[PDB]
Curated annotation (Swiss-Prot):
Residue ranges annotated for the C2 domain, each copy included: 1-118
Keyword Cell membrane: no
Gene designation per UniProt: NEDD4L
Membrane-spanning ranges: none
Organism: Homo sapiens (Human)
Taxonomic lineage of the native organism: Eukaryota, Metazoa, Chordata, Craniata, Vertebrata
Name of this chain's protein: E3 ubiquitin-protein ligase NEDD4-like
UniProt note: domains: WW domains are involved in recognizing PPxY motifs in substrate proteins.
Effect the entry attributes to changing E563K: In PVNH7; increased degradation; changed function in regulation of TOR signaling
């Protein structure tokens, strides 16, 4: 009844009713919006906010009908109202749907049940800034019962927006990409020398602190591996599925028997078999001399490597020399080159790669790489050679990618759950269609793409626009949307990348690993500190730092070795790296988000993790021996 009204002085009572929204603008496809109206009563001259309320959110409706009332005790000579229609379902894209500002000097006074019921008034929505697409009208009923510009960026800078809806600033002087808005003062006299150089050294120290995995009569069919346990009885284990057998699967399969030994996914033993399979092809010049300059580490390297006709030359020993450096190749130049070059290759400035929707560290192939760069297919082949060169020589790369990126190299099928790390907004809406009935959304097997402000209609399947999606065909709809959004739009780049990668390593030799272990092959194991990790965790749904289960969980993490802890870190946070400062700066889907442990489900169920919020759903296990048994399975099995 109060409705955040005012009192004292001298004023009148104004009743404002929000009726409905008409033809609200759409931002995401599927028409999935949760509009809500925020009402702010403020003072025009003072620009001071006095009252703020909001209306209940109406989910999945482009024309909602709130039909709610509020009251304010203010004078019509100094106060104004601002009704802003926002969205809830948006995670990365802006959720501003419109705004209307109304004065009070010209509002009629009429108490209810006195005169004829006045109709509903319509107000046109307006954008808050230039980068705000709004459309439609808001429905208001206001009465009085009582008788009684973008700031200029510094030169050499421009503001861009990626396909995920976020805004990042690009500098054309130092060729660097940053998220925070640049300051008016360039101060490019001390910042570069005393911050960039220090940060370069700080990043270089971390890069040297990551240890490689190996720092501790035909071929088998792809995915298989041969090992020798005790008693010397050689056995074969199929990493595809989880089966293992004594018999040789090299077309010597007249009978199927699988007693063997219990499955043991040993990452170290995978690499040892992998290393024994690489070969030096015939006669190669046992040297590879490159004279590179640090300022042009990317252009000079690209010309040299891509000028090699036969890739077999790359397999010889690397001999990298920089100008004015009279040193020796004691692993201090080959590894340095793979670090300096890694910054240029995996740089969103060039448009080849962009950051993911789950954090600001992982990288994904930019779908618009063809527009940004005319030679995108050429560079990705070059990246394939360099990435394939590091694995062959056992070096490390300073670049991490999303999980679906490693699936494509292994040639796996991308499912719905793989889009969680690509487009978070798409993943939530698509998963909603999978569970709930999409009948109310009135979706068709067609898509509407906007190019340069021009809306065009695209048919997912023939006669798509005349086919309605329902509870039966929804799974067909989900797969086509995945193909149209992610798989098909980065397939051309991935094939170009894989062509270069296979020029050094056969693709059948890399399918032994999975999408989690393959990341640690090219990047190397990190240094995860549990003491810092434990101090920066958040417990929800009744869990407390003194809870017996939480004590049992952290005791299990300590017992795990170096490899298992990183796999747990990949399982929850979605990546194998921690921020430079530490675990206090973990980033979620829509900003910073600390590691979270939540009580969920029943004791028999396995733990689940949501990479968007670094959240682990840990069921309340009765005993520590039971918790550790199932925690290891969830980390090792779930990928």
């Amino acid at each position: 009844v109060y409705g955040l009204s005012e009192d004292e002085g001298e004023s009148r009572i104004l009743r404002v009713k929000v009726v409905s929204g008409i033809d609200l603008a759409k931002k995401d496809i599927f028409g999935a919006s949760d509009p809500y109206v925020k009402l702010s009563l403020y003072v025009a001259d003072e620009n001071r906010e006095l009252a703020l309320v909001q209306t209940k959110t109406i989910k999945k409706t482009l024309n909602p009908k709130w039909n709610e009332e509020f009251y304010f005790r203010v004078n019509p000579s100094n106060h104004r109202l601002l009704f802003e229609v926002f969205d809830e379902n948006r995670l990365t894209r802006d959720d501003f749907l419109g705004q209307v500002d109304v004065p009070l000097s010209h509002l009629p006074t009429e108490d209810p049940t006195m005169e004829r019921p006045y109709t509903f008034k319509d107000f046109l929505l307006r954008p808050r800034s230039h980068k705000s697409r709004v459309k439609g009208f808001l429905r208001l009923k206001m009465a009085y019962m009582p008788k009684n510009p973008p700031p200029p960026l510094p030169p050499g800078w421009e503001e861009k927006v990626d396909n995920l809806g976020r805004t990042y600033y690009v500098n054309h002087n130092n060729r660097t990409t940053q998220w925070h808005r640049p300051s008016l003062m360039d101060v490019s006299s001390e910042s570069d020398n005393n911050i960039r150089q220090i940060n370069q050294e700080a990043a270089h120290r971390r890069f040297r602190s990551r240890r490689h995995i190996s720092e501790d009569l035909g071929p088998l069919p792809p995915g298989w591996e041969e090992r020798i346990h005790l008693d010397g009885r050689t056995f074969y284990i199929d990493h595809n599925s989880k089966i293992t057998q004594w018999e040789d699967p090299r077309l010597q399969n007249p009978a199927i028997t699988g007693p063997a030994v219990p499955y043991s996914r040993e990452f170290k033993q995978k690499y040892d078999y992998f290393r024994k399979k690489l070969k030096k092809p015939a006669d190669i010049p046992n040297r590879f001399e490159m004279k590179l300059h640090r300022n042009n580490i990317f252009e000079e390297s690209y010309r040299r490597i891509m000028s090699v006709k036969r890739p077999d030359v790359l397999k010889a020993r690397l001999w990298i020399e920089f100008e004015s450096e009279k040193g020796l190749d004691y692993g201090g130049v080959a590894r340095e080159w793979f670090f300096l070059l890694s910054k240029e290759m995996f740089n969103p400035y060039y448009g080849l790669f962009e950051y993911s929707a789950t954090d600001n560290y992982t990288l994904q192939i930019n779908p618009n790489s063809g527009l940004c760069n005319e030679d995108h297919l050429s560079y990705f082949t070059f990246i394939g050679r360099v990435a394939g060169l590091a694995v062959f020589h056992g070096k490390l790369l300073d670049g991490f990618f999303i999980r679906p990126f490693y699936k494509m190299m292994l040639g796996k099928q991308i499912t719905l759950n793989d889009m969680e790390s690509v487009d978070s907004e798409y993943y939530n809406s698509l998963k909603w269609i999978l569970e709930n009935d999409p009948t109310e959304l009135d979706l068709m097997f067609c898509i509407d793409e906007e190019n340069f402000g021009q809306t065009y209609q695209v048919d997912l399947k023939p006669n798509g626009s005349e086919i309605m999606v329902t509870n039966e065909n929804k799974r067909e709809y989900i797969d086509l949307v995945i193909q149209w959004r992610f798989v098909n739009r980065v397939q051309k780049q991935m094939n170009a990348f894989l062509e270069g990668f296979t020029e050094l390593l056969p693709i059948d030799l890399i399918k032994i690993f999975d999408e989690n272990e393959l990341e640690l092959l090219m990047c190397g194991l990190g240094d995860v500190d549990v003491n810092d990790w434990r101090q920066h965790s958040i417990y929800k749904n009744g869990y407390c730092p003194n809870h017996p289960v939480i004590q049992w969980f952290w005791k299990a993490v300590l017992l795990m070795d170096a490899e298992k802890r990183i796999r747990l870190l990949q399982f929850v946070t979605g990546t194998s790296r921690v921020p430079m400062n530490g675990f206090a700066e973990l980033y979620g889907s829509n900003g910073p988000q600390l590691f979270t442990i939540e009580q969920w489900g029943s004791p028999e169920k396995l733990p689940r993790a949501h990479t968007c919020f670094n959240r682990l759903d840990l069921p309340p296990y009765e005993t520590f021996e039971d918790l550790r048994e199932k925690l290891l399975m969830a980390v090792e099995n779930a990928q």
